[PDB]
Amino acid sequence: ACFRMTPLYNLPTHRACNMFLESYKAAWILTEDHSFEDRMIDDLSKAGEQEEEEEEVEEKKPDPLHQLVLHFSRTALTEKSKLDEDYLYMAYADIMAKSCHLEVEVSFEEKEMEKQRLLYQQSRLHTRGAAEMVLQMISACKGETGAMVSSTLKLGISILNGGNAEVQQKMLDYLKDKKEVGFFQSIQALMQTCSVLDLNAFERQNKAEGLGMVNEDGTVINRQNGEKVMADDEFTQDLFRFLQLLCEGHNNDFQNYLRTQTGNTTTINIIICTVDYLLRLQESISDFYWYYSGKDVIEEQGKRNFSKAMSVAKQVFNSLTEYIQGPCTGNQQSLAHSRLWDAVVGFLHVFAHMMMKLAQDSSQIELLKELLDLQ
Amino acid sequence: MDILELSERLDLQRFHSHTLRLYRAVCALGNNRVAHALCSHVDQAQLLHALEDAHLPGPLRAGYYDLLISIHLESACRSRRSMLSEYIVPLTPETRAITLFPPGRKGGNARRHGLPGVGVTTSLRPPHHFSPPCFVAALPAAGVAEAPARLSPAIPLEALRDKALRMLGEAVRDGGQHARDPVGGSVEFQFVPVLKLVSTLLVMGIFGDEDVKQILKMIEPEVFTEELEEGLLQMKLPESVKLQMCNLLEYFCDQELQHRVESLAAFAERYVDKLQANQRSRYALLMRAFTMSAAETARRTREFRSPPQEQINMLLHFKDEADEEDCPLPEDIRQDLQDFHQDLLAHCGIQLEKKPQSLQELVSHMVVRWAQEDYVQSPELVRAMFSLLHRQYDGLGELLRALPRAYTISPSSVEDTMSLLECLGQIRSLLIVQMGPQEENLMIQSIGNIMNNKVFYQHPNLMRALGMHETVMEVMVNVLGGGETKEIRFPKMVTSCCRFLCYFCRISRQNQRSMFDHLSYLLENSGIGLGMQGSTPLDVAAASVIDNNELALALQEQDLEKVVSYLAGCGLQSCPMLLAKGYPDIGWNPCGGERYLDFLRFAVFVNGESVEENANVVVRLLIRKPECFGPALRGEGGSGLLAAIEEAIRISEDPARDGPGVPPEENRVHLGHAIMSFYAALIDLLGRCAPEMHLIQAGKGEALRIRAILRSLVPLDDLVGIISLPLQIPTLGKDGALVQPKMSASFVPDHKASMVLFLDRVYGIENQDFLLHVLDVGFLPDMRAAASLDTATFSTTEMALALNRYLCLAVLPLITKCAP
Amino acid sequence: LVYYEGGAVCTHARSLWRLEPLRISWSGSHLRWGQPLRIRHVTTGRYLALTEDQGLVVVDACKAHTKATSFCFRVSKEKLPKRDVEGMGPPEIKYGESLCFVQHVASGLWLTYAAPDPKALRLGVLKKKAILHQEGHMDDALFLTRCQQEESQAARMIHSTAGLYNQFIKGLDSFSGKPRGSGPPAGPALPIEAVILSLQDLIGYFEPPSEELQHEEKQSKLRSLRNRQSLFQEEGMLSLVLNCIDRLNVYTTAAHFAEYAGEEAAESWKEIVNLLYELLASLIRGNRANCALFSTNLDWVVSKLDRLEASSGILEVLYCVLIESPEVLNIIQENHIKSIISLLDKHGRNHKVLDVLCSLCVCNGVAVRSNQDLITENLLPGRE
Amino acid sequence: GVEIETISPGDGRTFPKKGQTCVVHYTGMLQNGKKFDSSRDRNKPFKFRIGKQEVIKGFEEGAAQMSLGQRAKLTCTPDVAYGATGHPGVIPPNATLIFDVELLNLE
């Protein structure tokens, strides 16, 4: 068809404009970047020019930014069987999230400037109840994964960067006095729904790219439609990153809270469930080696599936490290009485044969060095 | 008594206010037939006078305003409002005149922003339809569910908009007077009902350009000066009317977004033409480049040997300036594009003193002012204002979320698109109303109009962008969910929708992936649709799978195991509708089974080749549950397939057990044939699940195992006996008439073709002795039969053509294969 | 008959068993292993035991002879009752952990589900009957988990609630015929004061939270109200009150009620019939399940609109169902609509009637044109 | 089958025949005096084409009887009106109709 395929000038004007628009947005508008998030928070954080009366009572009526959090708190505390998607909550949560970070022998005297500015930016949010709003939304998603809970976890990380001490204090206090079970019920449900490596789906994808499908109005070469393996790879990453940030800074009080909740009616051991998920990832990474054990070289999509699975495994190990550092004797006993050892021996078996196979050539120097930092 | 007396008679006022609420309720949600009836009780003169009656009480005034809106404006406003979310921009000279900024001389980057809602909009929106309210006209001879749907009652709109502008001016000036006697009894009762009318007329587009100019002067005079009278924004209004203020602004902001989209379409119109001309000239230069070039021309002609989708992507790929070498566009066109990007982002206010000087700055300043002045207590008002604030800041994001619904159309097909938009209007309006026969006829006519509209094939991308497949899916979901325990009421429009979705999938592959995301939902909904006969939703599921390899074959194992569990139930229980029609009781449903088996046939066999991943999985699911195969081959108690085919022949040929015994029903179930077709489908399905020949020689362990499994389940000898089983041959007799059998109640060549496919794929013919063994027992009488029936009379008969297709599709290639 | 039932069945009050010890003092002491103690069902007021004709079954408290009712919670199936301690003693048995095997202290038999699974369990909901097996299976381990105090208080209330109204119903139908004439009543005097006091207690118990409450805590009060109302309907008193109205409503007036129940109950007739209607409204208020149950017997309330003893209560009761259940509107026929319109003619211009009519036109944003046309057909052209 | 009664004399010599549109400012009323319809509330004359039975036959025959420019009163029985079927939600079944017909002009 290529040599007989009609040139561009022969296309009708309306048809040509139709795919012209989608190409223009994909190449010029999506690529364009607009930095307005910080200026939005700056505008919403000023409760100015209404203080002409300066009343003694000083009830401290909420500033515009505080009104967002209060409105998003009530829509999450209201009683609904299913929590629906709000495009406005998507936008404002993402704006709040990416309005916080804003980021070779740099010295520590100017290094502390960015940190104390970041702490100021997080203080701008958590001083208005945003920490509890995040807690409510997580306990309100009922274990149903989606863009809503992903945006909520994104905001919780952006407000918890560097392990904010007072933020962890507020989150722990709000859980301790509310004594609600649904928060950890959701955390367990979301984590249990996290996807693992799938050989059958990988083989199906390999056949799909072998066929190499094309559309009608033109042609896309080796189409990059959504991969059915590690589709929620970033969601599994930042869920454990959020859990790690909650225990970061050796918050022993919260560390014992994860292992057991004395105030709560029922106890859900997040640490044990975390080990169970790591076990499932261990099996999936083991059989994905065993697929390539007979083979000699690792292809392009294969090594990408290693890279993203290993990055998730790294995040899991960092979260486990933060669970037990301090040291936390309760967690140490829980790990001892868990199935962690089976994952440890299985990973060691995997690591041996990855290092031996991948060292035979210089084409997997990356996948070796990202391997090496994982153990 | 005087109506104004109700300001003291609180007992009567509350009741009559509720009466007006009831008048809105009966005419609510497009009940235009009742709305015409209410014109008798409350007329145009009363409603128009009641608008201007300044001494009317609060609830009565608001009730009368909202009643006027409900009777005359709500249906048109609702349908037009839904139509505003899509931007179908035709290519017309008036579209070509659309620009981001009015022609001015302020600055090279951008000029002052044009007045919102002022100008021309070429976006396609259906015109409103109104029927004047008359009661002296004769009662129509047409009955219910056949007569055309009533339109909204008419009312003078130019007079209504002028009265609204005059009244709003009176209210605004009275607001500035700080009077102690507000109209209706409060500021809220003075401003909320009139602003609802203003918002509704603005949405309907009744107001003209000058009318919009007057409104902008009233809302904010000094900012909106094109080049006491205090604007609305300085009137320290209560919370309730602030919501209507936001509703006005999100309309003006919508108008600005539409103006931007139209400008993009106009720029696309010009840019495509000049880019095509440049590409044509470059192609002509390439035609003479072979004199002064060599084999490196492949990189220059890569554009013309590559499809246009990435041609434009390469041509447009010069934004970051690090890729200018690849792009062959001249710098004048490159300047044209980057200039239009510059004023486009300037129009969105990216980059380029208390005066806002624009709607974008004014809305943000006002909303922030409202929030910081007091603690807003209305959650809806909070969500309303922050929707506006987000839209003002995220100028590009809203454009990025509006471009996927944008589309351009040919000027010669505008009336056809105008018609399909009108037809889609009823379709959208019927999802908010309980299903009825009257609505059923209207939607069936609407669907047929979509069929007869040629644009439905010309532009599938637009048809996908409108998302009709979604709406037609939920209008089914209402029916399936409604009464799923008892019976699926009104199947007439259900089969019409299924026929539409099935006809929709075959349009293109992208239309097939749109349905592909909705299988497990649809298959789940097909659990109760088995009682209904015709175009079942299962056929929609199959139609989303046929003739597609990479996309359509990603069905999950959970889907397959749940479908085969349905097959197990159908092979375990009789059809309830069959039992209800007096049919003799047999412990399994053949029609339901054969319906599942043709779906599983399409699930595993695509483009003449079996699918390895689907084949073993489905065969494993059937082999776990022996009841799926039916009463035959169950194990112990499962008779041979020759016994099953024989008893199916006797049941079909002998009445009083083949049917009700009391096709006349046009889908008259014949049990013996249905059982026989079930077994034929089962053999056909296994044959299509057979491992491929090229895989057999590779020595694959599971491919060999699966082939041995099918050979062990289905013995070859019974298949030979089925081939040797005779046909019902049409004869010549009974005054020379065409003595022909009943197709759906007699033995057919199609079931024999299903036998042949299993033969040529599972067992195969490898030696002469077994070749000629089958040839002289079953093939020779049939092939002679087709030639004998090939005469001056019977050659055109349905049985003869059945033999012709049967031999030429499956039988004849098998002997052609085994010719050596 | 006691089973091992799954789903939301056992999160209700039917699965509440009281560990009543044999000790008079320190009955709340922490349980050791194998302490003899009875088992009580609070919602029915009966005690678990093993009898002769039908094995391990719950029996009336009057026949809890401490032999077949006493049971011991043993650590394992191995063969293992110590002295009572004047205090809590050692805290050993934990809530949600510390698995126990319940064995009959007298018969020495262990709890176990009935092994056969019939054709009902072949395709239907999986519930298995418990049999006091001689040796027991391996998976017969049992968990003990906490229950909330407020619902436990309701559980104790629900039994006395059944007892008083069931006894009242038994008193009521005793004079179904047999007019008193001029002599004494048919039988024992009715508990009018006890019933009325119970009605006031239950109506206040089911009062919805006030509007002016803060948005946060109010939602929790809604959850408490939904839970308590769901339990009461699940225990069946929504039907019981309907029986109370059905028994009383067949008498035209209080003087006609005096002919059967006696003159002493004539004065209280108006009060009891009203308060039952408000209690019924409180039960059905805000509940999807309870409002949806009146679709089947929708004509019951509609048939009683013309009664003069209680019109406001019945109209508000009707209002609660319509404003929550969309499917109830689909059941409404022409006769009901004309009857509701007749309420305006037989009771004056009551504005709540129009509220009912407004509710009829639209359910939760979905128009019901089958009822809108009937309303405007029967009401608007009359002009009266 | 209808009864007419002139109210104010107009032409008295010209009759509305086939070929010209009939324009009226009518005012229909119920048997009990409950006004339900008119044209002057809408402030626009009502135009209808004589001949194709688009309007009710009693009104048609009355307009045919009465002359041009002559204000009239009509009376339509249910036998010549919607009758037993009745106009839905407007006119009750089997209702006598009274019309304050003003044939202002033809064409």
Coordinates of N, CA and C in Angstrom, one line a residue, chain A residues 2-3 5-25 27-32 34 36 39-40 43-44 46-50 59 61-62 64 67-68 70-71 74 86-89 91-92 95 203-204 207-208 211-219 221 223 225 228, chain B residues 91 264 267-269 271-273 275-276 279-280 283 302 304-313 315-316 318-319 337-338 340-341 344-345 350 368 371-376 379 382-383 386-387 389-390 393-394 396 400 403-404 406-410 459 461 508-510 513 549-551 553-554 612-613:
Chain A
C2 N 2.1 1.2 0.5 CA 2.9 2.5 0.7 C 3.1 3.2 -0.6
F3 N 3.6 2.5 -1.6 CA 3.9 3.2 -2.9 C 2.6 3.7 -3.6
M5 N -0.1 4.7 -1.9 CA -0.8 5.5 -0.9 C -0.8 6.9 -1.3
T6 N -2.0 7.6 -1.2 CA -2.2 8.9 -1.9 C -1.5 10.0 -1.1
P7 N -0.9 11.0 -1.8 CA -0.2 12.1 -1.1 C -1.2 13.0 -0.3
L8 N -0.6 13.9 0.4 CA -1.3 14.7 1.4 C -2.3 15.7 0.7
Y9 N -1.8 16.3 -0.4 CA -2.6 17.3 -1.1 C -3.9 16.8 -1.7
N10 N -4.0 15.5 -1.8 CA -5.2 14.9 -2.4 C -6.3 14.7 -1.3
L11 N -6.0 14.9 0.0 CA -7.0 14.7 1.0 C -8.0 15.8 1.0
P12 N -9.3 15.6 1.3 CA -10.3 16.6 1.5 C -9.9 17.6 2.6
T13 N -10.3 18.8 2.5 CA -9.9 19.9 3.5 C -10.4 19.6 4.9
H14 N -11.7 19.1 5.0 CA -12.3 18.8 6.3 C -11.6 17.6 6.9
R15 N -11.3 16.6 6.1 CA -10.7 15.4 6.7 C -9.3 15.8 7.1
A16 N -8.5 16.6 6.3 CA -7.2 16.9 6.7 C -7.1 17.8 7.9
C17 N -8.1 18.7 8.1 CA -8.2 19.5 9.3 C -8.5 18.7 10.5
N18 N -9.2 17.5 10.3 CA -9.6 16.7 11.5 C -8.4 16.1 12.2
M19 N -7.6 15.4 11.5 CA -6.4 14.9 12.1 C -5.3 16.0 12.3
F20 N -5.4 17.1 11.6 CA -4.5 18.3 11.8 C -4.7 18.8 13.2
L21 N -5.9 18.9 13.7 CA -6.2 19.5 15.0 C -5.6 18.6 16.1
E22 N -5.8 17.2 16.0 CA -5.3 16.3 17.0 C -3.8 16.3 17.0
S23 N -3.2 16.5 15.8 CA -1.7 16.6 15.8 C -1.2 17.9 16.4
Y24 N -1.9 19.0 16.2 CA -1.5 20.2 16.7 C -1.6 20.2 18.2
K25 N -2.6 19.7 18.8 CA -2.7 19.6 20.3 C -1.7 18.6 20.8
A27 N 1.3 18.0 19.6 CA 2.7 18.4 19.4 C 3.0 19.8 19.9
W28 N 2.0 20.7 20.0 CA 2.2 22.0 20.4 C 1.5 22.4 21.7
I29 N 0.3 21.9 22.1 CA -0.4 22.3 23.2 C -0.1 21.4 24.4
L30 N -0.1 20.1 24.2 CA 0.4 19.2 25.3 C 1.8 19.4 25.7
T31 N 2.7 19.7 24.7 CA 4.1 20.0 25.0 C 4.2 21.4 25.8
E32 N 3.3 22.3 25.6 CA 3.3 23.6 26.3 C 3.1 23.4 27.8
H34 N 2.4 25.5 31.5 CA 1.9 26.7 32.1 C 2.1 26.5 33.7
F36 N 1.0 28.0 36.8 CA 0.0 28.9 37.5 C -0.4 28.4 38.9
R39 N 0.8 30.5 41.9 CA 0.1 31.8 41.9 C -1.3 31.6 42.4
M40 N -1.9 30.5 42.1 CA -3.3 30.2 42.5 C -3.3 30.1 44.0
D43 N -2.9 33.4 45.7 CA -4.1 34.2 45.7 C -5.1 33.7 46.7
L44 N -5.3 32.4 46.8 CA -6.3 31.8 47.7 C -5.8 31.9 49.2
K46 N -4.5 34.5 50.8 CA -4.5 35.9 51.3 C -5.9 36.3 51.8
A47 N -6.1 36.3 53.1 CA -7.3 36.8 53.7 C -7.2 38.3 54.0
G48 N -6.9 39.1 53.0 CA -6.6 40.5 53.1 C -7.8 41.4 52.7
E49 N -7.6 42.7 53.0 CA -8.5 43.8 52.7 C -10.0 43.6 53.1
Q50 N -10.2 42.7 54.0 CA -11.5 42.6 54.7 C -11.4 42.9 56.2
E59 N -13.3 35.3 65.3 CA -13.7 34.0 64.9 C -12.9 33.3 63.8
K61 N -12.7 33.6 60.3 CA -13.5 33.1 59.1 C -12.5 32.6 58.1
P62 N -12.8 31.4 57.5 CA -11.8 30.8 56.6 C -11.4 31.6 55.4
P64 N -10.0 31.8 51.4 CA -10.5 31.0 50.3 C -9.9 29.6 50.1
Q67 N -11.5 27.3 52.4 CA -12.9 26.9 52.0 C -12.9 25.8 51.1
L68 N -11.8 25.6 50.3 CA -11.7 24.4 49.4 C -11.7 23.2 50.2
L70 N -12.5 22.6 53.4 CA -13.8 22.4 54.1 C -14.8 21.8 53.2
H71 N -14.9 22.3 51.9 CA -15.9 21.8 51.0 C -15.5 20.4 50.5
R74 N -16.5 18.0 53.5 CA -17.9 17.6 53.7 C -18.4 16.6 52.6
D86 N -15.1 13.5 40.9 CA -15.3 15.0 40.7 C -14.1 15.5 39.9
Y87 N -14.4 16.0 38.7 CA -13.4 16.7 37.9 C -12.8 17.9 38.6
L88 N -13.6 18.6 39.4 CA -13.1 19.8 40.1 C -12.2 19.3 41.2
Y89 N -12.5 18.2 41.9 CA -11.6 17.7 42.9 C -10.3 17.2 42.3
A91 N -8.8 18.5 39.6 CA -8.0 19.6 39.2 C -7.4 20.3 40.4
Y92 N -8.3 20.6 41.5 CA -7.8 21.3 42.6 C -6.8 20.5 43.4
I95 N -3.6 20.6 41.4 CA -3.0 21.9 41.6 C -2.3 22.1 42.9
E203 N 2.9 -12.3 26.9 CA 2.9 -13.1 25.6 C 1.8 -12.6 24.7
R204 N 0.6 -12.3 25.2 CA -0.4 -11.7 24.3 C 0.1 -10.3 23.7
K207 N 2.5 -11.0 20.9 CA 1.8 -11.3 19.7 C 1.2 -10.1 19.1
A208 N 0.7 -9.2 19.9 CA 0.0 -8.0 19.4 C 1.0 -7.1 18.7
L211 N 2.0 -8.6 15.3 CA 1.0 -8.3 14.2 C 1.2 -6.8 13.8
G212 N 1.4 -5.9 14.8 CA 1.5 -4.5 14.5 C 0.3 -3.8 13.9
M213 N -0.8 -3.7 14.6 CA -2.0 -3.1 14.1 C -1.9 -1.6 13.7
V214 N -2.7 -1.2 12.7 CA -2.7 0.2 12.3 C -4.2 0.6 12.2
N215 N -4.4 1.9 12.3 CA -5.7 2.5 12.1 C -6.0 2.8 10.7
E216 N -7.1 3.5 10.4 CA -7.5 3.7 9.0 C -7.1 5.1 8.5
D217 N -7.4 6.2 9.2 CA -7.1 7.5 8.8 C -5.6 7.8 9.0
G218 N -4.7 7.3 8.2 CA -3.3 7.3 8.3 C -2.8 6.0 8.9
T219 N -1.7 6.1 9.7 CA -1.1 5.0 10.3 C -0.2 5.4 11.5
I221 N 2.8 3.9 13.9 CA 3.8 2.8 13.8 C 4.1 2.3 15.2
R223 N 2.0 1.1 17.8 CA 1.1 1.9 18.6 C 1.4 1.6 20.1
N225 N -0.5 1.9 22.9 CA -1.7 1.7 23.7 C -1.3 1.1 25.1
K228 N -1.1 -3.9 29.5 CA -1.9 -4.6 30.5 C -1.1 -5.2 31.6
Chain B
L91 N -17.0 24.3 7.4 CA -16.0 25.1 6.7 C -16.8 26.0 5.7
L264 N -9.5 28.3 16.1 CA -8.6 27.2 15.7 C -9.1 26.5 14.4
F267 N -8.2 28.8 11.5 CA -6.7 28.7 11.2 C -6.4 27.4 10.6
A268 N -7.0 26.3 11.0 CA -6.8 25.0 10.4 C -7.2 25.0 9.0
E269 N -8.3 25.7 8.7 CA -8.8 25.8 7.3 C -7.8 26.5 6.4
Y271 N -4.4 26.9 7.1 CA -3.1 26.3 7.2 C -3.1 25.0 6.4
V272 N -4.2 24.3 6.4 CA -4.2 23.0 5.6 C -4.0 23.4 4.1
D273 N -4.7 24.4 3.6 CA -4.6 24.8 2.2 C -3.2 25.2 1.8
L275 N -0.4 24.5 3.5 CA 0.5 23.5 3.7 C 0.4 22.4 2.5
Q276 N -0.8 22.2 2.1 CA -1.0 21.3 0.9 C -0.3 21.8 -0.3
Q279 N 3.4 21.3 0.1 CA 3.7 19.9 -0.1 C 3.6 19.5 -1.6
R280 N 2.6 20.0 -2.3 CA 2.5 19.8 -3.7 C 3.7 20.3 -4.5
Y283 N 6.7 18.1 -3.8 CA 6.5 16.8 -4.5 C 6.9 17.0 -5.9
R302 N 10.2 9.9 1.8 CA 9.6 9.2 3.0 C 8.2 9.9 3.4
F304 N 6.0 11.1 1.2 CA 5.0 10.7 0.3 C 4.8 9.2 0.3
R305 N 5.7 8.5 0.9 CA 5.4 7.0 1.1 C 5.0 6.7 2.5
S306 N 4.8 7.8 3.3 CA 4.3 7.6 4.7 C 2.9 8.2 4.7
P307 N 2.0 7.5 5.5 CA 0.6 8.0 5.5 C 0.5 9.4 6.2
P308 N -0.5 10.2 5.9 CA -0.6 11.6 6.3 C -0.6 11.8 7.8
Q309 N -0.9 10.8 8.6 CA -1.1 11.0 10.1 C 0.3 11.4 10.7
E310 N 1.4 10.8 10.2 CA 2.7 11.2 10.7 C 3.3 12.2 9.8
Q311 N 2.8 12.4 8.6 CA 3.3 13.4 7.7 C 3.1 14.8 8.3
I312 N 1.8 15.1 8.8 CA 1.6 16.3 9.4 C 2.3 16.4 10.8
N313 N 2.5 15.3 11.5 CA 3.2 15.3 12.7 C 4.7 15.7 12.5
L315 N 5.7 17.5 9.8 CA 5.6 18.9 9.3 C 5.4 19.9 10.4
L316 N 4.6 19.6 11.4 CA 4.3 20.4 12.5 C 5.4 20.4 13.6
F318 N 8.3 21.4 14.6 CA 9.3 22.4 14.7 C 9.1 23.4 15.8
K319 N 8.4 23.0 16.9 CA 8.1 23.9 17.9 C 9.3 24.3 18.8
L337 N 2.5 30.0 11.9 CA 2.1 29.1 12.9 C 2.6 29.6 14.3
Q338 N 3.8 29.9 14.4 CA 4.3 30.4 15.8 C 3.7 31.7 16.2
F340 N 0.5 32.5 15.3 CA -0.9 32.1 15.8 C -0.8 31.4 17.2
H341 N 0.4 30.8 17.5 CA 0.5 30.2 18.8 C 0.7 31.3 19.8
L344 N -2.5 33.0 20.5 CA -3.4 32.0 21.1 C -3.2 32.0 22.6
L345 N -1.9 31.8 23.0 CA -1.6 31.9 24.4 C -1.8 33.2 25.0
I350 N -1.6 33.7 29.0 CA -0.4 33.0 29.6 C 0.7 34.0 30.0
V368 N -12.5 35.7 44.2 CA -11.6 35.8 45.4 C -12.2 36.8 46.4
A371 N -15.1 35.3 48.3 CA -14.6 34.3 49.3 C -14.0 35.0 50.5
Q372 N -13.2 36.0 50.3 CA -12.6 36.6 51.4 C -13.5 37.6 52.2
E373 N -14.6 38.0 51.6 CA -15.5 38.9 52.3 C -16.2 38.2 53.4
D374 N -16.6 37.0 53.2 CA -17.4 36.3 54.2 C -17.3 34.8 54.0
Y375 N -17.6 34.0 55.1 CA -17.6 32.6 55.0 C -18.9 32.1 54.3
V376 N -18.7 31.7 53.0 CA -19.8 31.3 52.2 C -20.4 30.0 52.8
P379 N -22.8 25.1 50.0 CA -21.8 24.3 49.3 C -21.9 24.3 47.8
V382 N -20.3 27.4 46.6 CA -18.8 27.3 46.7 C -18.3 26.5 45.5
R383 N -18.9 25.4 45.2 CA -18.5 24.6 44.0 C -18.7 25.4 42.7
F386 N -15.8 28.1 42.5 CA -14.5 27.6 42.2 C -14.4 26.8 40.9
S387 N -15.5 26.4 40.3 CA -15.5 26.0 38.9 C -15.1 27.1 38.0
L389 N -13.4 29.8 38.9 CA -12.0 30.3 39.2 C -11.0 29.3 38.5
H390 N -11.3 28.0 38.5 CA -10.4 27.0 37.9 C -10.4 27.2 36.4
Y393 N -8.1 30.3 35.5 CA -6.7 30.0 35.5 C -6.2 29.0 34.5
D394 N -6.9 27.9 34.4 CA -6.5 26.8 33.5 C -7.1 27.1 32.1
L396 N -5.6 26.8 29.1 CA -5.2 25.8 28.1 C -5.8 24.4 28.4
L400 N -7.8 21.9 26.1 CA -7.3 20.6 25.8 C -8.4 19.6 26.1
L403 N -11.0 20.2 22.8 CA -10.5 19.7 21.4 C -10.9 18.3 21.1
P404 N -10.9 17.2 21.9 CA -11.4 15.9 21.5 C -12.8 15.9 21.0
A406 N -14.1 18.5 19.3 CA -14.1 19.3 18.2 C -14.0 18.5 16.9
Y407 N -14.6 19.0 15.8 CA -14.7 18.3 14.6 C -15.1 19.3 13.5
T408 N -14.6 19.1 12.3 CA -14.9 19.9 11.1 C -15.6 19.1 10.1
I409 N -16.6 19.8 9.4 CA -17.4 19.1 8.5 C -17.5 19.9 7.2
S410 N -17.9 19.2 6.1 CA -18.0 19.7 4.8 C -19.2 20.6 4.7
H459 N -18.4 9.9 8.3 CA -17.6 10.4 9.4 C -17.8 9.6 10.7
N461 N -15.6 9.0 12.9 CA -14.9 9.7 14.0 C -15.7 10.7 14.7
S508 N -16.0 0.5 11.5 CA -14.6 0.6 11.6 C -14.0 -0.1 12.8
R509 N -12.7 -0.3 12.8 CA -12.0 -0.9 13.9 C -12.1 -0.1 15.2
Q510 N -12.0 1.2 15.1 CA -12.1 2.1 16.3 C -13.5 2.0 16.9
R513 N -13.3 -1.1 18.9 CA -12.6 -1.0 20.2 C -13.5 -0.2 21.2
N549 N -8.0 -9.3 15.2 CA -7.1 -10.2 15.8 C -6.4 -9.7 17.1
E550 N -5.7 -8.6 17.0 CA -5.0 -8.1 18.1 C -5.9 -7.5 19.2
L551 N -6.9 -6.8 18.7 CA -7.8 -6.1 19.6 C -8.8 -7.0 20.3
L553 N -9.3 -10.1 20.7 CA -9.0 -11.4 21.3 C -8.4 -11.4 22.6
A554 N -8.4 -10.2 23.3 CA -7.9 -10.0 24.6 C -8.9 -10.3 25.7
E612 N -4.4 -19.7 19.4 CA -3.8 -20.7 20.3 C -4.1 -20.4 21.8
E613 N -4.0 -19.2 22.2 CA -4.3 -18.8 23.6 C -5.8 -19.0 23.9

